[PDB]
């Protein structure tokens, strides 16, 4: 935050910096500062910063637990500019590229499922999940490959865990479920009965559709700290 206080370059000779705050579930709410050109003919600065998208790491969002879920990131889009502070809603999550690559290995079978879920709220989201097979302890052979019956059963299983987990829950409940990694955990326990599995994690979850004016949803997401539930 430099131009509003004092001298900075020709573009930033008339610019402002506005605090950006993330949802209540995250341990460190402040995300950072946004550079924005000062108010102009039709370009009101607050209207300009209404729909900016930030990419936050879960380690940055919930610090002190960096070693776990250092890979997991959350894309958050401002919906309100109240108090001079941008209030953001969850718009996407993805595992980091360095991790995505470490997930694949030769002699393993990869199961990726995409399941769009209509939430208990207005938002519609597609949950992209990934699972891999792992060597059983005895393993006379060197390849973690399974017959089709395990592949179908396991993929049917993945859809079922999402069906009774993320299928009918609202966005604040989803944010807690993807942050504590709870739903990722459920698929593994179900998969563990089905087969020897590794890396059963929801890799990406994208906002396919947004109910217009989720201002009420941004009150619950941002200031319902009291209703942590």
């Amino acid at each position: 935050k430099k131009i509003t206080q004092r001298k900075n370059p020709d573009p930033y000779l008339k610019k402002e910096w506005y605090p950006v705050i993330a949802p209540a579930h995250f341990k460190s709410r402040h995300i950072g500062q946004t550079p924005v050109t000062k108010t102009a003919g039709l370009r009101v600065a607050t209207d300009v910063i209404n729909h900016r998208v930030y990419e936050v790491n879960l380690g940055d969002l919930n610090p002190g637990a960096e070693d776990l879920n250092g890979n997991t990131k959350f894309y958050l889009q401002t919906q309100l500019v109240s108090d001079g502070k941008c209030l953001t809603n969850f718009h996407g999550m993805d595992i980091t590229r360095h991790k995505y690559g470490s997930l694949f290995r030769k002699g393993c079978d990869c199961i990726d499922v995409f399941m769009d879920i209509p939430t208990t709220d207005g938002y519609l989201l597609r949950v992209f999940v990934i699972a891999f097979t792992d060597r059983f302890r005895f393993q006379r052979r060197k390849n973690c490959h399974v017959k089709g019956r395990v592949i179908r059963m396991m993929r049917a299983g993945i859809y079922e865990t999402l069906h009774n987990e993320l299928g009918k829950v609202s966005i604040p409940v989803l944010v807690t479920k993807l942050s504590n990694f709870e739903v990722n955990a459920k698929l593994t326990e179900a998969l563990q009965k089905i087969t020897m599995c590794r890396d059963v994690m929801i890799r990406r979850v994208k906002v396919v559709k947004r109910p217009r004016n989720t201002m009420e949803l941004l009150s619950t997401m941002h200031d319902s700290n009291q209703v942590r539930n």
Binding site: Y12, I31, T34, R52, Y54, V56, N57, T96, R97, H98
Partner: protein, 125 residues
């Protein structure tokens, strides 16, 4: 003062640009090519070293005490290896005193890619 610096490395030229976390507003931009007259020297780390030094003065003036690093090659249907200036890009910022936040690959990798220039016989050089 966290911000994100996207560093195109690729080949042919190196682009070092620091931006807002949103990416909507660019705090600063510099290119390896601007520094060197010869076209071949543009991807080289010496050109890049002089290049990120120039950017540091502009960015630190505009706050930006801390930056996050996203580095990408040509990507898409080309190379997928950062190439020359990418290694210098973090190093020169470290000489400057900008603080690293998190490092990542921004390669535009393609699932099921479109065809690439060259032909079946390939570049017969």
């Amino acid at each position: 003062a966290f911000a994100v610096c996207h560093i195109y490395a690729g080949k042919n030229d190196t682009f070092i640009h620091v931006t807002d976390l949103s990416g909507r507003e660019t705090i600063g931009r510099v290119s390896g090519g601007m520094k060197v007259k010869r076209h071949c020297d543009e991807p080289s780390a010496y050109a890049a070293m002089q290049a990120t030094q120039d950017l540091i003065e502009i960015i630190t003036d505009r706050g930006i005490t801390a930056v996050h690093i996203k580095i990408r090659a040509d990507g898409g249907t080309g190379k997928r290896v950062y190439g020359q200036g990418g290694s210098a890009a973090i190093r020169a910022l470290v000489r400057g005193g900008i603080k690293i936040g998190r490092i990542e690959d921004s390669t535009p990798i393609p699932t099921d890619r479109t065809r690439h220039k060259g032909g079946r016989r390939g570049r017969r050089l």
